[PDB]
Structure formats: structure tokens, C-alpha cells
Amino acid sequence: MNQESVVAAQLIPINTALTLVMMTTRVVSPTGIPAEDIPRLISMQVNQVVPMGTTLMPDMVKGYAPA
Fold first, then answer.
1. Three-state secondary structure of the chain
2. CA quadruple 23, 26, 32, 33: dihedral sign
3. Which domain holds residue 26?
4. CB neighbours (10 Å) of residue 48?
5. Cα-based distances in Å from 20 to 1, 5, 44
6. How many domains does the chain have?
7. Cα 43–chain centre separation
8. Is 63 left (phi over 0), alpha (psi -120 to 50) or beta?
9. Residue 37 CB: number of other CB atoms within 10 A?
């Protein structure tokens, strides 16, 4: 019963096309984008230099949005 948020699997610079090799899941705080968006962030770049271990936010992804 833990919310798994997207976590920069590795260094992710600004305007970096997110990839399944650059994203992952991990219980972090505060929580950000849901792991259920993993396949959503894919192909989508970031609107900021997000370093590894840095939780992914819905306000840190370009062309992102809910459903």
C-alpha cells in the first residue's frame, strides 16, 4: 500500500527524452509522478535538469498531463 512515484533512474538533463532506461519506481517523499505514468513519461522530455535519485514530478515533464 505504498505509492510508487517515478524516480530518475539516472542523470536526466533538461529537454532529455525520458526513457525506460532513465526512469524507475521508488517510495520517495514527497511523491511525484505515479509509476503508472512510466510508460507515459517515455518519449517525453523533462522541463528541467532532473538528476538521478530526484523524484519525478508532473510539473517537471514537458508534454505531460493526467488522463
1. CCCCEEEECCCECCCCCCCCCCEEEECCCCCCCEHHHHHHHCCCCECCCECCCCECCCCCECCCCCC
2. positive
3. 1-67
4. 15
5. 24, 14, 11
6. 1
7. 11
8. left
9. 22
9/65 Cα distance (integer angstroms):
21
What's the CATH number where 40 sits? 3.90.1210.10
Query: Which residues face 31 on adjacent strands?
Result: none
For residue 29, give the nearest of 10, 5, 52 by alpha carbon: 5
Which residue type is seen at 67? A
Distance CA 42, CA 18 (A): 5
